[PDB]
Design a protein around this ligand. Structure first.
Ligand SMILES: O=C(Nc1ccccc1)Nc1ccc(-c2nnn[nH]2)cc1
Lengths: 67, 68
């Protein structure tokens, strides 16, 4: 089958994930995709794509970086 | 050690020469007790390595993911 770009592993996102329920975030190197952010959740150990506009993500990433 | 028994921060060492093009993804650990929270999974060899948070391209990489 023909493919016209690399597939985006994230097609849908969750908007109601809390920072406290995240083991880690993964930021996928898929810059042409709208959704690059995955969370692995603490309560069940599953991965979900998450809303990149969640304000807590920004402070989470700033703290990781400004070290 | 199993993780359940580990008190050590996960990243012992970091790498400063990881090219953006060789990164499958960055994993940002939720470990505020620790200095190094950024792990890259590499495309060419599939290793996970901790990376220097001052690596040149990381900030722009992360900002682009957010700015959609
Ligand atoms: O392989 C790497 N590290 C490692 C850690 C423990 C044991 C053996 C090896 N690092 C690595 C970093 C960057 C690149 C690379 N190639 N092109 N762009 N980045 C390849 C390997």
């Amino acid at each position: 089958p023909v493919s016209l770009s690399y597939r985006c592993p994230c097609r849908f996102f969750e908007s109601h994930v809390a920072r406290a329920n995240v083991k880690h975030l993964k930021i996928l190197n898929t810059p042409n995709c709208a959704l690059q952010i995955v969370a692995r959740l603490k309560n069940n150990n599953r991965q979900v794509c998450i809303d990149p506009k969640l304000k807590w993500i920004q402070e989470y990433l700033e703290k990781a970086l400004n070290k």
